[PDB]
């Protein structure tokens, strides 16, 4: 998987907008994820009490974790694929199956298009899709290395 430097610039430009409201984006993303895939809620001790969108919006656990997710992902995306030093320990900490990373990728794309439609057209969406795909493949490689079949 390869992005052009132009595509990386699209990803970083929209990421700059994410960074103006990390917590709000994080909430929107996790809420979208949990509404699309409610079956995942039960897997997280810190989230399994959340049943409804109202409970999700009011949750400090969800807000704080949204910030964690986007901070980790932001640092990775800014490496423009040269993210081994960031990705190795992150893979370490995980479990989170690969399909959950797919779910969250989909929620990221949806939210960024919803919040920043001018700066997140077809080209930027494609670039972000590739960037998140590269991330998932590389983390999958780190998983399989330690035998977590992800």
Swiss-Prot record:
Broad enzyme group: oxidoreductase
GO molecular function: heme binding; metal ion binding; nitrite reductase activity; oxygen binding; oxygen carrier activity; peroxidase activity
Heme recorded as keyword: yes
Binding site for O2: 65
Annotated positions binding heme b: 94
Impact upon substituting residue 118 to A: In metmyoglobin
Catalysed reaction equations from the record: Fe(III)-heme b-[protein] + nitric oxide + H2O = Fe(II)-heme b-[protein] + nitrite + 2 H(+); H2O2 + AH2 = A + 2 H2O
PROSITE patterns per record: GLOBIN
Transport in keyword set: yes
Subunit structure: Monomeric.
Record's protein name: Myoglobin
Annotated organism of origin: Physeter macrocephalus
